Structure 1
Amino acid sequence: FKNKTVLKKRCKDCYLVKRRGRWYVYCKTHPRHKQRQM
């Protein structure tokens, strides 16, 4: 994951999920698109 203030979906398989009180971008096809809200 990479820490980001603005989260962006870089594929059509990227999904925004809020867990542990923070939004997250998870991608099961391109895991480089993993993103953590700061």
Structure 2
Amino acid sequence: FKNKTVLKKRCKDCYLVKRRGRWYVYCKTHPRHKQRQM
């Protein structure tokens, strides 16, 4: 999915975490909010 240097929570359901060495943002309600950290 999309890779951004800076991350942003679009909706409250968006939750950001640190997985396999990078920052991720996941939202099950709005999967299009998924956002990788470059």
Structure 1 unaligned segments of length 5 or more: list them.
Answer: none
Task: Name the Cα RMSD after superposition.
Answer: 0.5
User: Identity percentage over the alignment?
Assistant: 100
Provide TM-score, normalisation by structure 1: 0.94
Structure 2 unaligned segments of length 5 or more: list them.
Answer: none
- Tell me how far apart the structure 1 counterparts of residues 26 and 34 of structure 2 sit (CA, whole Å): 5
Provide TM-score, normalisation by structure 2: 0.94
- Tell me how far apart the structure 2 counterparts of residues 17 and 29 of structure 1 sit (CA, whole Å): 16
Count of aligned residue pairs for this structure pair: 38
Runs of at least 4 residues off by over 2 Å: none
Relative to its length, the structure with more strand (as a share) is 1
